[model samples]
Target: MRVVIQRVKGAILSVRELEIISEIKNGLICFLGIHKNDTWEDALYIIRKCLNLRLWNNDNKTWDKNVKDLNYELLIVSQFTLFGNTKKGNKPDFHLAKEPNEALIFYNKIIDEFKKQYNDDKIKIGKFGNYMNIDVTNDGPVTIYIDTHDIN
Candidate 1:
C-alpha cells in the first residue's frame, strides 16, 4: 500500500453529484492506494503513520502533537493511480493495484479503524472508484509519501 499525506487547512472532495467537505484547523488529506497483496495491517500502519507524522506547526517545523492532540481531521480518498507502473510502455499499467473488491474491503477497513482510533466526527471520506475533484488549501504545502512495505 502507498499513501500520500498532505497538511491542509480545509478541503472538499466531490464525486459525481456527491460531495464531502471538511474544515481542518490542523489535519491531513490522505490519498491511499492499495496494492494487490496489501493487508488490513498495511492499512493500519498507514493510518498510524498519518496520525503520528509531525508535519504541522507554527514555524513550519515539525510539531510535537499527534493528529488526535491537534484535533486533526482526515479526508481519505481512494487513488489506484498511485501504483501506476510506468517502467515498461509509455502507458501506465495498473496491474499492481488492488482489484475493486479487494480495494473496497481495504478502504472500509481503514475507515472502520480510523473511527476506532480517533473521533468519528472528524474523519471524512471520498467515494471509492469514482472520479473525484479535490480542492484543498494547503498548509505549509506540506506533503509526504508513505509506503506500507517500507514500515517493517
Candidate 2:
C-alpha cells in the first residue's frame, strides 16, 4: 500500500459528464495505491498515518495539530498510477499495482475502517475505477508520501 497525501484548503473532484463527485474543504487529499501484496496491516498503517499525522500548525508551533484535532475532512482517491514503474523503459507500467477488482474491495474495506477510526461525516471519496479530474487548492503546498513496502 502507498499514499500521497496533500494538505489542501479545498478540493473538488469531477467524473464523467462533468459531474462533481466529491468535494472537501480544509483537509487532506489522499491518493492511495493498493499494492499487489498489501496486507490488512498495511492498510491499517496507512489509515493511521493519514488520520493522525500532525500536518497543521497550532498557535506558533509547527506541525502540532492533526486533521482530527481540527475536525477537518479527508478526500480519499484510488490511484493505481501511484505504483507506476518506469525504470525499465520510457513506458510506465503498473505491475506493482493490485488488480482492479480486488483493489476495489480492499479499498472499500479501508474506507470503512477509516470511518470507524474517525468521523464518517468527515470522509469523502472519489469514484473508484472512474476517470476523475480534481482541482485542489493546496495549503502550504504540503505533500507527504508513504509506502508500506518500505516498512517491511
Candidate 3:
C-alpha cells in the first residue's frame, strides 16, 4: 500500500548478488510495500506514482525531472514490513502483506512497468527473497513516502 522513495545518491544482496555502484551526480531508489487487500489497480497506481515523482537534481533547482527523465539508477525492493513495522517493538505485522506468492505478483508488475519506460541499466532489483545490504548514501537524505490511498 505504500512506496518509500529513498535517494540512492548508492547496495548489495548477499544471496542474490546485487551491487550497484557508480560515479554520477545522483538518482533515486524505491522500496515498495504491498498490503493484504491491495488490488492490481492499487499496484498500478503506485507504479505510476513511482514513474512520476518529481525527485529533483541540483541542476533542476526546484523540481522537473523524474526517474526516467534523468535515467537515474533505480532499485525497487519488495517489502511488506514497512506497512506494519511495529508501532513500538520489532513485531512487524505480517498480516499487512499479501500471501508470499501474491505479493510477488505486484512486485513483478512494478518492475515490468519500469522496464517499459527505462533501459535495463537504469534499473536494479532485489530478488523476491534475500537480505540486501544497501551500500548507497541518500544524497539529500531525501526520502519521499507514497501511500496508495493518497495516490490515484
Candidate 4:
C-alpha cells in the first residue's frame, strides 16, 4: 500500500458530468494506491499513520498536532497512478498496482476501517476508478509519502 498525504485548507472533488462529489475544509487529502501484494497489516499501518501523524502546528510548535486533534476531515481517493512505473520508454506502466476489481474491494475495506477508527462524518471519499478533478487549497503545501513495502 502507498499513500500520498497532503495537508489542505480545502478540497473539492468533481467527476464526470461536472458534478461535485465530495468536499472538505481544513484537513488532509490522501491519494491511496494499493499494491498487488498488499495485506491487511499494510492497510492498517497506513490507517494508523494517517490518523495520528502530527502534520499541523500546535501553539508555536510545528508538527505538534494531528488532523484528529483539530477535528479536521479527510478525503481519501483511490489513486493507482501512485504506482505508475516509468522506468521504460515514455509510456508509464501500472503492473505494480493492484488489479482494479480486487483493489476496489480492498479500498472499500480500508475506508470502512478508517471510519470505524474515526468519526464517520469526518471521513470523505472520491469515486474509485473514475477520472476526477480535484481543486485543493494546499495548506503549508505539506506533502508526505508512505509505502508499506518500504517498511518491514
Candidate 5:
C-alpha cells in the first residue's frame, strides 16, 4: 500500500454527472495505491501515518497537530495508476498492482477504520473504478508521499 497526501484548503471528487464529495475548509486529501502483497495491517499502518502527520495550519497556532487533534476532514480516493512503472516505454507497467477484488478488500479495511474514528461524512470516498476528477485547492501547496513498507 502507498499513499500520496495533499494538504488542501478545499477539495472535490466527482464521478460522472452527479456523484461527488466535497470537503471545504482545511483538510487532507489522500490518493491510495494498492500493491499485490498489501494486507489489512498495511491498511492500519497507512491510515495511522496519514492521520498522524503534523500538517501546518495557522489555525493550529503551531505545527503540533494531527487531523484528530485539529478536527480536519480526510478524503480518500483509490488510484491504481499511482503504482505504474514505465522504466522502458510510454506504456505504464501495472504489473505490481493487486487484482481488483483483492485491492478492494484492503481498501475497504482502511475505509472502515476511518469510519470508526470519524463520522461517515468526515471520511469521504468515491466508487472504485470510475472516471473521477479531483479538484484540489492545495493548502501550503503541501504534498507528502509514504509507502506502507516503510514506516518511521
Candidate 6:
C-alpha cells in the first residue's frame, strides 16, 4: 500500500461529463496505490494514519491537531501509477500493481470499510479505471508520501 497525501482547500473529480466536488475548508486529497501483496490490514492502517496525522500547525511551527480534530474530509483517488517503475528500462513496469479484477475488489472493499468506520459522507472518490480530471486548490501545497511496505 502506498499513498500520496495532499492538503487541499477544495477539490473536484470529473469523469466523462459527471463531476463530484467537495468544498472542504480543510481536508486531504489522497492518491492511493495498492500493490499485489497488499491486504485489507494495510489499507486500514493507512486510513488510520491519514485521519490522525498532525500535519496542521498553530504557530511557531509547533504541531497542533490531527486531521480528525480539524474536521477534515478525505478525497481518495485510485492510482495504480504509483507503482510504475522505470528503473532499468525505457518503459515503465506495472508488474507490482494488482491485477485489474483484484484491484477493483480491493478498492471497493477499502471504500466500504472507510464509509462504515467514518460514519460520514465526506469521503469522496474518483471513478475507478475512468479517466478523471482532478482540480484542487492545495492548502500550503503540502504533500507527503507513505508506504506500508516501508513501515513493516
For each candidate in the order shown, give its overall lDDT on alpha carbons: 0.82, 0.95, 0.71, 0.94, 0.80, 0.82
Best by lDDT: 2
The alpha-carbon lDDT assigned to residue 143 of candidate 4 equals: 96
TM-score of predicted structure 3: 0.80
* Model 3 RMSD in angstroms: 3.3
The residue pairs that clash in candidate 3, if any, are 10-136, 11-135
What TM-score would candidate 5 get against the native? 0.88
lDDT of 3 by residue, 15-51 (tens): 4355543232356667788888887678777666677
lDDT of 6: 0.82
lDDT of 1 by residue, 58-85 (tens): 4545576667777879888888999998
Residue 49's lDDT within candidate 1 is 85
Candidate 4, residue 14: how far the Cα is off, in Å? 0.7
Clashes of 4: 0
RMSD of 1: 2.2
lDDT of 4 by residue, 1-152 (tens): 99999999999999995999999999899999999999899999998999999999877798888889999999999999999998999788999999999999999999999999988999999999888999999998999999999997
Model 6 poorest 10 in a row by lDDT:
17-26
Provide TM-scores for the models: 0.89, 0.98, 0.80, 0.98, 0.88, 0.89
Clashing pairs in 4: none
Worst 10 residues of 3 by lDDT: 16-25
* lDDT of residue 99 for candidate 2: 99
lDDT for model 5, on a 0 to 1 scale? 0.80
Q: Evaluate residue 65 in candidate 5 and report its C-alpha lDDT on the 0 to 100 scale.
A: 75
lDDT of 6 at 78: 89
| lDDT of each residue in 2-55, candidate 5, tens digit only | 889998878877878656654445778889999888867878877886778888
Q: How many clashing pairs per prediction, in order?
A: 0, 0, 2, 0, 0, 0
Badly placed stretches (over 4 Å) of model 3 are 16-25, 58-60, 85-90
